[PDB]
Structure formats: C-alpha cells, structure tokens
Amino acid sequence: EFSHEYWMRHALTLAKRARDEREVPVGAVLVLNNRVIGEGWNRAIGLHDPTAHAEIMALRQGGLVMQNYRLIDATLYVTFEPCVMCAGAMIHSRIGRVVFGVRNSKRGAAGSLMNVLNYPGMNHRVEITEGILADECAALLCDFY
Amino acid sequence: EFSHEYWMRHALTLAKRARDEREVPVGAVLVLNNRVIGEGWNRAIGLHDPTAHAEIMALRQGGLVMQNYRLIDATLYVTFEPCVMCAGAMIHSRIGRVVFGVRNSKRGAAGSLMNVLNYPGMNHRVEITEGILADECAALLCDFYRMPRQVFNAQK
Amino acid sequence: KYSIGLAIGTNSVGWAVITDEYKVPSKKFKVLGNTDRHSIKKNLIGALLFDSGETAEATRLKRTARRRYTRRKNRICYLQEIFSNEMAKVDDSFFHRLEESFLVEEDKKHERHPIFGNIVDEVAYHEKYPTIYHLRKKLVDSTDKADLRLIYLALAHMIKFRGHFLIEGDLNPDNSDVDKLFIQLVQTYNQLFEENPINASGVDAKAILSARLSKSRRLENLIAQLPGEKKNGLFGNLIALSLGLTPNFKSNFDLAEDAKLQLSKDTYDDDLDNLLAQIGDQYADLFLAAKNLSDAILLSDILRVNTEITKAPLSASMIKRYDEHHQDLTLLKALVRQQLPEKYKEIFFDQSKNGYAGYIDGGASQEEFYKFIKPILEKMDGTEELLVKLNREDLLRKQRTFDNGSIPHQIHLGELHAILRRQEDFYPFLKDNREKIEKILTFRIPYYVGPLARGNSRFAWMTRKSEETITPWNFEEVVDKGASAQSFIERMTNFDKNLPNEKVLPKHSLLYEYFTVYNELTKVKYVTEGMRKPAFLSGEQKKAIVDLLFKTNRKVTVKQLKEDYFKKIECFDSVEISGVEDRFNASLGTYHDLLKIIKDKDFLDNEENEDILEDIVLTLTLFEDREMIEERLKTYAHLFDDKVMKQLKRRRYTGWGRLSRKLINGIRDKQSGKTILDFLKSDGFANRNFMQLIHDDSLTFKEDIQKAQSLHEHIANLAGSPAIKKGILQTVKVVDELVKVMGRHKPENIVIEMARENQTNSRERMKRIEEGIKELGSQILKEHPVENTQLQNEKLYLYYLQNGRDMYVDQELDINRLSDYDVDAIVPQSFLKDDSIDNKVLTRSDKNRGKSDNVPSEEVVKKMKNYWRQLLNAKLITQRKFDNLTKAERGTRQITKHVAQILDSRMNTKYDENDKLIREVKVITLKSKLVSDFRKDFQFYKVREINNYHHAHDAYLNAVVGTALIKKYPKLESEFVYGDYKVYDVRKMIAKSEQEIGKATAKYFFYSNIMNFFKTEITLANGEIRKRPLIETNGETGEIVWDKGRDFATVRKVLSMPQVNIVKKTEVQTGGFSKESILPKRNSDKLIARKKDWDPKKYGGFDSPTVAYSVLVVAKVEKGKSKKLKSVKELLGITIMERSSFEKNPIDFLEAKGYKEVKKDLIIKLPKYSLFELENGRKRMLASAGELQKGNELALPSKYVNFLYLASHYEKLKGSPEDNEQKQLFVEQHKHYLDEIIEQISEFSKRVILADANLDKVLSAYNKHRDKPIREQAENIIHLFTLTNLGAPAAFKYFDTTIDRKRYTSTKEVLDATLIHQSITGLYETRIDLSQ
DNA sequence: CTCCGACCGTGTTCCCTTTGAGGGCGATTAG
DNA sequence: CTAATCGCCCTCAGTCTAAGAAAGTGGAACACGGTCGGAG
RNA sequence: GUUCCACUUUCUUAGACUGAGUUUUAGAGCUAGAAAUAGCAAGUUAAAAUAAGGCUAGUCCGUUAUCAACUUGAAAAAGUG
Ligand SMILES: [Mg+2]
Ligand SMILES: [Mg+2]
Ligand SMILES: [Mg+2]
Ligand SMILES: [Zn+2]
Ligand SMILES: [Zn+2]
C-alpha cells in the first residue's frame, strides 16, 4: 500500500486501459505528499501530437492543478524509463524524484543510454529509482508489440 | 522570398511578438515545401506550462495541420538554439532539418554542452544549419537580457 | 603531479603536499644512526614551530645608556685632571680615598673616612653640612676662603648631574615676581594703546596661569577674564608666547610673511630682529618684557622662593624641604607618642611595613608611604596641617626625587659661575680655568655628529678634519661638523630605484617642479571649432603658458586658466579640466620664493646658475642649523647683497622627492640627443608621458635603464616585523627541503596564506584620558579615581573617553549602568570587520543612532557635531573617525606580494625564446576568510588548544581550496595569481549597476558567489533551495574539478591522519647574561661577582644566569679522601657568559671545572629543545640543563574535536533554528563523548605525563561537577588540555580548582634516552642511542 | 581599385538572478 | 647526606632631532588589429 | 598587483640627553645588664659600579639577525636518504 509497487501497478492499469484504447501502453502518475495530482497515458497517435506522452501529460496536469510550472517535492512514477525529452521536462519541472521500471538502453535517458538529470551542466539534480516490476512491463510491451 | 533569411526574419517577428507578451523572445516556424505549416512562440509564463516553448508549439501545430506525428522532410526554423527538451522533441517528430541562428554555449543541445540530435543511437539523423542572422538574433537577446559581453563572447 | 600548501605565521609555518586527487603521499624515509630502526613511513604534512623574533630596540637603549655612562665618567676624569696639581698640595691621597670608597676597610689602602681622613673632621663636616646643598649655598653666598676639597665636592656634584638641555639660550632668574611683571605688561600695553586700556580687574593671574591645566586651557581661562580681548589679538598672542605656545603675529601687523616666535628655539633673537626691522624696534622692549615675564614664571613650580633673599634658589628650596621634613618628623613622633605609642615600633622600626622606617631604610616609595600613613593621620586629631602637606605632596619630601628632571642646566651653570667668581679671588687656577670648567658643563655632542669613532664603529659616520684626540674644548676645530651632518642625512635617504646609484633630488628642487608642471601640462588637451579632434599643447604654447602665467603668479587657479588664457587667447567661454580640482596641483613655489628673496628675476632665469641654485636649495634642504646654512651660503654673499643672504638663511625646506637628476634631465636618447625633460617641454604631435617615455619600445630609454635594474640580505631589507622575516626564512627553507624530498621536481602550484598580523596599551590609555580630561576641564577624575588596569574593561574605557556622556543623545551616562548600555559598530560589522575603538561606540540604546543598516543618520550628526568637535580638540576622538562622520554626512597585502615575488623569482629562473619569464610554478595567495568559511560550511572545525595539528590542517585546506579555485575559474588567475595582470575593469565602473554603492559590498557579494560550487544545495534568503550536479567540471575543457562523493572523504582522511611532523626549532639562547637585579651580600655559590675583585660573599652581585646550551661531558672526578677516580657522565650547563671561554679551549675549561681524562670526542653540544625519546614512546625536550618539557602531541579523534567545538559554542551559529536544534539533539545523544574524552586524557597522562596527583585531582573535580550543564563542562574540559599540551608545564583552572604546574626538576632520564636529531621538516632523523 | 590614413573597443564570476611566561633559587619535606 | 617540591621573583620613567615604509582618503596609467573614409 | 601627486595615522631604524632605582663604604648611637634581655635619641646625604670584559687603545665595541646530523671544504659553498 502506497509503496513503489502500488504506484507501479496503478500505472500498469493505466497502460492496460490505454492499450484497450488501442494506444501505446505507457502510463505516468505524479504524486506529491501522498496525494495523486497527475495521471497520464501515452496517446500520441490518438492526438496527432509527437509530444503527447504519458510523462508530458502528467506534468501538464500537475502544473494545471498546482497553477505553477514548478513541481518541487513531487514524485513521478512511470512503467518505462524516461526518454531525453521526458528527462528534460522533468528537469524543467524541478520534480523531486522519478521512479521508472524496465530499463531501455535504446531510448531510456535515465542511465541506460545516457545521463540527463545529474549532468554537470544542469542547474538542478533529480533523484532516480529503478527496478520496480520490470518483468511485467517488459512482458506487456512484448505482448503489445 | 522563401529563402532562409526570409523564414528567419519571420521567426524573429514571432520572437518579437513573444517579447510583446513579456515572454522570453523565442520563435519557431515549421515549413514543408515552401508552405507555411506551423508557427509558435514561447508562452510558458503566461500559460503556466514549462513546455510551452516556440519549438513545441510549432511542432504541435504542424502535427495538427498535417494530421500526422511524422514530419518527414520538414524544416524547423528557430531564432535561438533549442534546449535538450526541444532537441528531443525534434528527434521524436522526425523532422528533416533544424535551422537556428545565434549559438548559446552554456546550455546548447546541439554540440556545445552535448550532442543529442546526431547521437549515434538515434533512429533518425536530423540536419543542423547554424548562424542564420546570428547578429540580429544575438542583438535581440542582449537587448532583452540587458547584460553585455555575453553575445560578443559567444560570437568570438 | 603535486602542489604544496603553506600557512605562514609569526610563530609557526604549516606545510603540506597534495596530489592531483587531494591525497597526501606517504613515503618511507631512511633513518640514520646506530639504532635499531632503519626506516620510517611518514606522511608529507607537518608544521615548523619557533620562538618569536625580537626587535633591536632594547639593544639600542642599552648601547646609548652605556655611552652615556662612559661620557659621564670622562667628565669626572676631566675635572680631576684639572684639579690634580692643586689637590696634590692640599691632600696627597684625597682622590685615591675617593676612588676606593667602595672597598671594605680590610681592603682599603688608606683610611676609611674619604673627605678628611679622620673621625673628628668627618663628624664635624657632617654636623655643619648635613646635605650637599648646605655646602652649595654656603659656598655661593659666603665670602670666606674655603677648603679646596669642599669646592671640588660642590663642583663635582653640580657637574655629575648637570640637568636637562631642553631650553636653549640663557635665563635671567633675578626677576622672580609674577604680579608686578603682569601689572607692568598691562601698564605698558595701556600706555601704547591710549584708545583702549585693559583693566587689571583683580585677575589672580598667578593661580590661573600656574594651574595644572594644559597651555590652551590656561589661555582660554586667561582671556575669559578679559572683556573684548581675543586670543588672536596682540595681548592674546603675547600670553600665548609666555605660555610656551607658538602663535602667529602676521595678522596683527598686516605682514604678508609669517612671523612665528618660540622662546625655546635658538633662532628667536633673529626672528625677533627681523620682526622689529619690519615693524620698528620701539616694540622690542615690549617683547623683552614678555620674555622677562616668561623667565619669572618658567621655574615657578620648582623654586617656590623669592630670588631676592639668595642667589641659589634651588639649594635654598632643598634646605627648605629639609627643614620642613625635620619639623614635621619631630611633630609626628610627638603625636604618635602621645596618642598611639603601641604602633610606634611599627612606624619607625619595622623596615617591612611601608612606614617611615620602610620609607627611609626599606624599598617603599613616597606613594606607598603616603597611602600607608593616610589612615593613621586621619584617625588622629591635631594633624590638620599634615593633611594639607599630604595633598600638596610636600609632607616628608627628600631632595633626590623622581620629579627633579624639570631642573634646567642653566641654574646649575649659574651656581657654578657664582661659586667660581666667589673663590677665584683666593685661587688663581680657578680664575685661569673658569672657562674650561664652564665648557665642561655646557658642552654636548650634537646629535648630527654621532659617535666620535676612529674607523671601528659600525654605527658611526663622523669624519675628522684632523687626527687629534677630541676634547670638549677643541671639538669645533677638530670635527668637521658640516661633512658630518651631510653624512648623517645622506646615509638614510633613499636612492632612485630606476638608477640605484643616483641620489634622489630634493622635493623642492626647481628641476623637480619643472618636471612635475611639464608632466601635468603634457596631458592637457584642447579643441576648437576648426580642428577635428582635441589636440595636445605644443612646445611654443607650453613656453607661453609658463612664461606668462607660471612665472608671474605664485599659484595658478583654474579660473585664471579659463579667463586669462582660454578666454583671452582662445575665446572659450567655458572649458573642462579633468586631472586637477579647482587649481593646478603642480606649482612653481620655489621660483616665486627665490624671486621674492633675491629680487632678481634675470638671475633665476639664467640657465648657468641652475646648478648653483639647485645647490643652494640642496643646502637649504640639507641643513637646518642656521649657523651652518649661513656658513654654506657664505660663498655667494657677494652676488647680490648681505640682505638677500640674511633672508635666504631663514628659508628652510624639508622632504625629498622620488627621482634623480639623471633620470629627469641626464639621460639622452642616442638618436634624438634629447633628455626626458626635453620631450616633456616639446615632443611635437604626441605629447608623450613620462610613463610612456619610460615604456616606449621605439625609444631606447627603457633598455638603457634595464642595465642597472643574497636571500638573507634581501629578506632583511624588507619592511616589517622581524618575526615575520624569521617566518619568511623558515618557509623558504621548508620549501627548499620539500623540493629536495620530491626529487627536485618543482610543484605545479604554491598556495600561500598568511595570518592576521595587525593584532600582533594601558599606559597609552591612561595618558589619552588624562590629557583629554585636563583639556576638557572635567572633574570626573577627581570624583572617580581610576587606575590603568581598570581601563582594560572596554565599556569603562569608552565611558572615560566620552567624559561620562552619551555619544548620540547629548546626555550623561552612569558608571553603574554599563551593563544596560550597548556597544554599537559605527560602520556595521557585516561590511567592515573592525573590532577596534575607532569603529565602536557606547550608547544607552542603539535606536538613537538612527538607521540600523548604515552610519548614524543626519539628525544625529546635526545634533552632536559640536560635541564631536569638542572631543576632537580634546583628543578624545581621532581624525579618522571625524573625517568618516563628515563624509558620511556629505555622502591582499604588500608583505604577501613580497613573499610571492621572492618565491616566484626563486622558482622561475628560465626565459623563453622571446626573453620572457616561463612561469612553471603559479604562486596563489589566499586570504584566511576562504578557508575559515570553508571550515564553518563543511564542519571542519578547529580547536587550537587540543594540539598543533591545526597549523598543518590549515595549510592542507589552503592548498586544496587554492588549486580548486584556479582549476574552476582560470580567468580569475589575474586576481589570484602573481604576475601577469589585466588592465581593465576601470571603464566598467562608469556604468550603472544593480548595487555598487560600496566596494565592500561588492567584494562581499563577489566572494559569496564565486565559492558556491563547493556546496551541493544552496538556500537563498527567500525560503528557496537551489540544486547543483554531483560532478563539478569546467565548461570549456570538461575536466573534472570536483566530486562531492569522494573528495570530502579524502579530506576527512587527511584531517584524521594521526602522525604529523611537528618539529620545534632548536635554538641557542642569546642576550643578557642573567637577571639585572643586584642582590645583597649572601653566603651562596649562586652569587656572581659584579667586578673581578668584588667577592660576592662580601659585596653581592648577580644571580640566576642563563644556559646558552648544555654539553655532554664524560670524564672522571675525585671522590673521597683518597681521590678515587670514579667515572661520570653528566650534563654541564655552559652559561652565556662562559660560552666564549668554553669554545676557546673546551679541554682547559673542563679541567678547570674539575673533570679529568675528558673524552674530547664524546662532547655533544645540546642546544635548547633537544629531543630525547624514552621507552614506551615517551619523549622529553631539553628545556634547560636541569629541567625538561613535554614532548608528545595528543592526537584526539576528529569526532571528539567536532563534538567539543559544537558543545562549547552554543550562543552562536545563527540562521535557521532547525540545524541548531539538530545539533542540540546531537549533543544530548552523544553526551558520552565527554567521558570518552576524559578517559583518553587519563590514558595519555598515565602513559606519558606521569603526574598521578594532578590526574587524581582532575578525576575528582570532574566527578563532583558531572551534574552541571554540558556547556560549562565542555569549556572546562577544553581547559583540561593544558595538562597534556606540548612544551613547558603550566598551571590551569578547572571548575575553580587551580592546578599548579608539575615541573620536571631532574635530567637523569635524558642521560640514558635516545637523542633524535630532526631536519627542518622532520622527515629525516638521526637517532643516537646514548649508551656510552 | 589597391593604396594611405585616423580610429575604437573588449576583455572577472553572468545567458532570467539573489540581494606576560618560564627558568632560578631559598626553605621545607623525605628516604 | 642526598634529592623532590612550594612559593616567590623578574630595572624604569621621560625629552628632542632625522629618515623610511605602510594603512585609510582622494586625482591620472601599464595597448593593438583590423576597419571604415578618401585617391589618381 | 606596479606606478606619478596631495592629506591623516601608525610602525621601524639610527643619534644626542635627563631624572630615578639597586649594591658596598663614611655619617664616633646612648643608658643598665659580662650575656640573653630591655628602655631612650637620631633617620633626608655623599663616593664608586651599573652587564663579567676586549684590543683595534677610540670620549670605540659588548643583549639585533643567523644556526638538526655527517661528509668535502679557512669563511662562503656543495653533496648525502
Ligand atoms: Mg665599563
Ligand atoms: Mg641616595
Ligand atoms: Mg637570538
Ligand atoms: Zn517519452
Ligand atoms: Zn526549449
């Protein structure tokens, strides 16, 4: 309850709903102070928008609810390692921590392919968490593709 | 007409519109086949969205007008140099080329701080055109910041 | 590969070596000697310690005193040689008995009574003349022929103590009356000014003028009693003259020239002559009367008796003192007999009580005696007058007192001459030799001549006109006074740095002022309507401006430039001048002075007399003795008139310029043939500056100069305290040995820090207050008497400096309410780290200062200005504070640069192909604030008392921070690295900025910004957090500069390293042989004879000599009645006095001391601080031949050091309360650290200190005080560390319990220890097993 | 159209900011 | 007849002359490679 | 940082001086009591020394600075891990 596995399974349920919607099964949940503030799923094809990812939608919903572009002390859970654009958006959002699941050496910019959050040229450092339900996410991705 | 300088001048006109709105003066235009497909300017502060950059707006408009997330062979013109976020979005959009003006070698995402557009593991190579109207772009930025010695140092 | 960190202090030089990753290498060094160990691993960190270097002052004082003594002796010898023949007829052995008076009767050659040789005559003498002054007065006033021995005694007594020489000329002391003279002055003044007479008005002039106030105050009071009379007026100036002040008479007589008269100055007669020639000599008698009145009052404090009765007022005043002493002693004795005879024995018999017996026979002072008998007196009745005498300080006064220094030599000369006239009628030789004797008393070697040496005095410079022996009578003829003064001045004046062999020109040289005026004119530009750019002035225009303006008006104002030049010749209605403000800074003052004196402009303008004129100005500068200036100018008296020479004598200049004659007008460019002054006068289109001339690569001046342009001499020639020079030498040697250790590879960077040297006064304070109050006229000293040691309290000192008044509110303060008052910083401490009184102020409430963020507001200034003025005139506030208040109303260091230059010149000695220095080593200089802030920020706390490791730690952190700083921002190299600089940032300050109201705030912001890269998260003052990456890199190159995840761990490992090479510099003790005290006779072998024949058992002498260095002696000494040869090995202390004798022949010295079969090859010189190790690692340092010091350092773990620091400092570390609370909970969680620290201390003491009693008392005292608050206990545990500290044992207080120092009164164990010879760094050791 | 000639600014961090002591010595203690 | 302890103790005050450096205030430097304006 | 000019405050260096302080000696102590023991009377001054001393023989110098250990070296200086 309220642990990393709980939010990981919630994002997996969101990804299954998005797949039922015939979209990419990628979900993101932004929670601050144990309160869910943003939820999103990757629906780039369903909206004809290359920037319509789960992480981007969650960050936009969080910014709209908080009425502020800064997301200090927020935690973003995601069933997929964030890409370069998602990592840049997390940096600009000034979030507290990002918890991703299955690694992605080809697209994940959170250590697998490169490092973005803790780069020496950045003006902000974000914490990283990995290794939560990677097998289930990989199996779901293989079943979808 | 329809030359690189013409489009950069239009992008500067949009950056000046952004300056009118009291926003960071950055503009972008997405062009396909000498036809206007999308235009945008930075509207982060006034619309409370850290991703509302000129490039993002132009890419989303192009995607909507073309009803396709893939913008094969399109050219995106932007006055300033795009950040890491914008470079990633350009990669995801699969556009053909990005044309920027003045560099900025303290956050640049096209070689200065790092190379992302031409990264070896990407599934698409985006071409880069640099220095179009670099003098007007840097003068606009210096006049906006009101802090000298930065533009001259970057140019030199 | 490696950099060296250095921390240079007055008593310590810390050193460390670090690598690219902030690691300190650990190396295995070979150990030499005959011992077991062959090598030791050592960390490359340590610190050299040494005693402070001392100034040369005391040596100078001693030397001058010596010279004084010898010269006095020579005086006496002259007198005796004059009297010899006539004494031989009267008494064959008088002088012999005189010279042997110190010898005991058993040792005397002649009879014990010096003067006459028998009891009856001696008793008769002492009965008729109880004091010498009786004989003086009788010999001056009487007419009977006197015994030659009494005459000699008088003359010798007057000659041996001649009195001071502070007043010049002669005095007329016949006139003793102040009232009649003042009434006469007022009379003649009222005669000369019939229109307005002064009323005598019953002004008690005697009391006001002779009161114990300052000259100025007495003047103010005098003229306050006079209606309509101003201090600047004629009569006011005359009163000022009689008071010893310097008044100016020019405004009274409409004289354009200054007319300042000082009765003490030897030029008074000539200045008055000139004044009377200007104004008419009918006023001469007037000033004569003023002088006569000054004479009648000069000595009123001492003589106290009308000069009518006698011609010897001094001797008469002494006889008076004697009689009053006698009478009051009889009276006091009678009183104590009548009323308290039980205390009579205590008053007149006990030498130890400070009574009358202690006063006369014991070492009790007049003050201590007075304080002693004050209560006895006041408790009794019938002593109403004795108290009056006591307050006058005139109760039981002696004749030889501390206050007799006021007596001028002119009165002793008067009495001498009187006696000579009296007795020259009976003795012809006194008549024939009167002048000689008078010249013996009068003569005084001039300070500008110096020691009368003959080529064997390092300090002397005087030159001999002839090779005679110098006496007081032939001094003027034998000594070349002129060349001696010339040497006196030329041996001290600076030489031109550009031309080191050339003397600097006089500051008022005509050439120097031509150079300066032209150097200023050369950079003046002008523009007109026609021309297209502003143009320089040409040669013709410059000659025009000089000849027309500079040679006609003494000073040239900007208004005169505009109107008389710019308007008349260029028709310019307005123009701007940029380098001078409202007037030309340069001026031809000497040209107009001379023009006024010689009155012949054409003489001055002739170029051929330039050298002559320069020589005249040189003479005018070189001398100030008018008789010598006149002698120097006597040659040119024929060129214009006697009057011009008379006027030229008075003209005097002081000061010397900066450049030489050859630099300004001597060097000629080979191609041009023109001197610097020629280019300044005319250089065509480019009006090149002197700086440009000196730096123009096209011209050959710079290279022609660069021709002319020892480590110990170089360091000794610097300006500063000898202590820091000592430190400089030590650090240079340390650097050398470090380079040798590192295989002769030079370091990449040398980061140097220097400790605050400004910190390294009761008498001065008492003087300041005394003067300020006397001038102010306040009674607060009489109402509340203070003592110097009371002024050490800051609030009290302030209170007295402000005359018990509020500084902001114009109200009185209370000497009982200082705890309620506040000490406010004038300029807030946040901007200026000034802790002195110059920036501190005592007020009842800081709210009355005005605004909190600034200097006191304009209202406070308006309200308090006049009070501050009064404090300024009373010297109660300085000039700096005043000038800061005023402008506030109208809106690293040189020594470190010298060090950096010495290091850079020693390390970089090679030149590239372009003949430019190859800077292989970068010298970086940092201030202490960087490392201090770094320690505070990252909790690398420092507690000095735990051990000496902090000296090394500071150097390590200096190196680290320096290398990091230069690595991250290489462009700041110009600021932080010596040498190559950047000529910019001057135009940047001509533009508006965010906040540039003060350079201090700019520096603050700057340093607070640059050092942010060390932190991981920043908290701005808005409740805002700022994040920084984990790895810090330099953008342009990408090289990693810092790693927050590992560099801190390395720093902590370095700080925690247990073994650190702390080496105390062994030094041979030098200076005085022993204590100066001369003790009474005593049967003890410690008493050292004061003279060869003065056996200390009979005469006493000196005691407690200082051992220069010990020496190991192995030999044999007789034992028992049969003189068996026993074998001995012991330490014999060679005293400083014995040193030379021991070095000249040690074998003979030891044989004379009682040693036999001395093994010469086993003699080991053991200077102070020699290190000896004993088993279990316990070590001792040689403190003396009979005492040892502690030789160990307690390495306390860093956790306990930080805990102790945080626990001792509670009312500090401001900011967010959360961190303070977390530190409080850390203390309460780790309170057991106290017990662990005391356990550690106990283990250490039991293993090394070996003082069971002191340790048991520590343990007990701590056991009783465990209940007390942790803060107190922590502070007193910090106190506990002096038991374990290095060096001499010392006493300490723990929780009000005082622990006397446990000294090590034996040296036996050292004699079987292992001697450790240590290098300067302590890396190389030679251990000697003293088993032999 | 190359040749002659007077002229001028950019350089520190900075690209939405943080504001008195210590060794000597006599008298006492201790085996 | 030896050594180890405990207290007590320790030269000082002032005047004048000269030169220099070293802090705080003020006023001014320590240059050149193109580069744009005219010419016969 | 270097450097040209003006104002102030401190410090350093060298010179000429003064007044004290300390130590021995001369200031015929008296009256009972052999002695311990006690009473009474004076008490202010003066001479010499003021680092022991040295030769260069001066009306000069003598308390500043410098100095781990060994080796090669009159001094200086260089080498040794
Ligand atoms: Mg002598
Ligand atoms: Mg006496
Ligand atoms: Mg010494
Ligand atoms: Zn993404
Ligand atoms: Zn962007």
What do you see in this structure?
The complex is a heterotrimer, with two copies of chain A and one copy of chain C (1332 residues). With 145 residues, chain A is of the alpha/beta class. Chain A has one domain (1-145). Helices cover 38% and strands 16% of the residues of chain A. In chain A, strand 3 (75-78), helix 4 (84-93) and strand 4 (97-99) form a beta-alpha-beta unit. With 1332 residues, chain C is an alpha+beta fold. Chain C has seven domains: 2-50 and 721-748 and 895-1060, no CATH class; 57-165 and 409-488, no CATH class; 179-298, no CATH class; 313-406, no CATH class; 495-705, no CATH class; 762-889, no CATH class; 1190-1312, no CATH class. In chain C, 44% of the residues lie in helices and 11% in strands. Chain C has 55 helices and 31 strands. In chain C, the strands form eleven sheets. Chain C has a six-stranded mixed sheet, with helices on both faces. A six-stranded mixed sheet of chain C has the order 4-31-30-25-26-27, with no helix packed on it. A three-stranded antiparallel sheet of chain C has the order 23-22-24, with no helix packed on it. In chain C, strand 1 and strand 2 form a beta hairpin. In chain C, helix 4 (132-141) packs across helix 5 (148-160), helix 4 (132-141) crosses helix 13 (313-339) and helix 29 (626-633) packs across helix 30. Chain C starts with a strand and ends with a strand. The relative contact order of chain C is 0.07. Chains in contact: A-B, A-C. Chain A binds chain C through residues 72, 118-125, and chain C through 1025-1033, 1035. The site of one zinc ion has 6 residues of chain B, from helix 4. Chain C binds three DNA and RNA strands through strand 4, helix 1, helix 2, helix 3 and helix 4.
